[PDB]
Subunit: 116 residues, 4 copies
């Protein structure tokens, strides 16, 4: 998978399960355009987001529905969601991993690019 | 000041100086309308973004121009910008502080909410 | 105040109030000698930890009692405490601010260093 | 492996390679006692830290030599190292993963406990 997403829960010390993840790509018209989506597994990952042919250079946005996750646990959240926006593949694609760490009033995100 | 923002540089060990901060409010057509903007001082804070009279109920988006910051410094950034999206003042007026910590391939964000 | 500390709660969206902060300095026998201690105020900061006369060159350790904090709140903590170890004043006197963000299973820490 | 460590670099967006990791366990005498150690691979992990028979309930400390890593890249660091101290296995062991994200003047750590 050229693009992987991994979501973790900082309150219970576990992978975040059943979380919706949506990915968008910027078009030449300058608008956001659906590209890929899924729901996190027991590993905290939505499996098989995209393919190598489809993931070209460009500007991408990863949206994680954090509000629905916390509401289900009976814990009051701050954010509507968590978004990560980045430029891809500027010197070709490799393998991209986007990680997100979640708390009710905070989140952190990191990108790991590794040689395939 | 009911909305405050503070930005830090994890590479140089200093406040992130001269960074643009943009604020938008969600409209009834589901578009983002400009609400307020400013630039960080030597302390990493933009002073006087808004007022108590202007800051009503709604869904808000805070956007930090991380890309122009790393470029002026001669460092390659991954993210286009760092975002924060939240519902404000739903159970009455409150004061909000948004903290952001910046690295070339990662960021974190937290919120502190106090009753005025 | 050449050494400052600030602590935040990522679960409640507030400063971490009434948390103990302990400071140690490395001795010539390679043991940690007590140097200073305090408790966080309503702002999440312990005021007046040390002075310019007392804060000489050396290797320092800052320890935050996260375990007693989560327990008073009726939440299960993972970490015993949050630590920060650094060499201070090697190229002359400086001022240091240590920021810490706390969740039950995670923490982050950053340093801001300014010339006095 | 009952205990795994994973180290990431926030400046270059890669796994942190060739980093020394030391693990200690608290003894009844209240002193720190070597338990396991290794060097990070190309994945940012030191492989095969311990075994199931050896990793019993107790208080543990994970030390990551961050200063030697940054010095080798020609980038000036703040911390001497990064330490994580925690109570293990209180209701039996499971599988423990300790993650660490590194910048010159900052680090963050998280623990993920999953059912084996």
């Amino acid at each position: 998978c050229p693009l992987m997403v991994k979501v973790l829960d900082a309150v219970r010390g576990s992978p975040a399960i059943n979380v919706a993840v949506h990915v968008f790509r910027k078009a030449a018209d300058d608008t956001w355009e659906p590209f890929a989506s899924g729901k996190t597994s027991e590993s905290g990952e939505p499996h098989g987001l995209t393919t190598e042919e489809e993931f070209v250079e460009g500007i991408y946005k990863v949206e994680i529905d954090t509000k629905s996750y916390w509401k289900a646990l009976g814990i009051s959240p701050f954010h509507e969601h968590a978004e990560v926006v980045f430029t891809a593949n500027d010197s070709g694609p490799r393998r991209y991993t986007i990680a997100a760490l979640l708390s009710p009033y905070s989140y952190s995100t990191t990108a790991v690019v590794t040689n395939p």
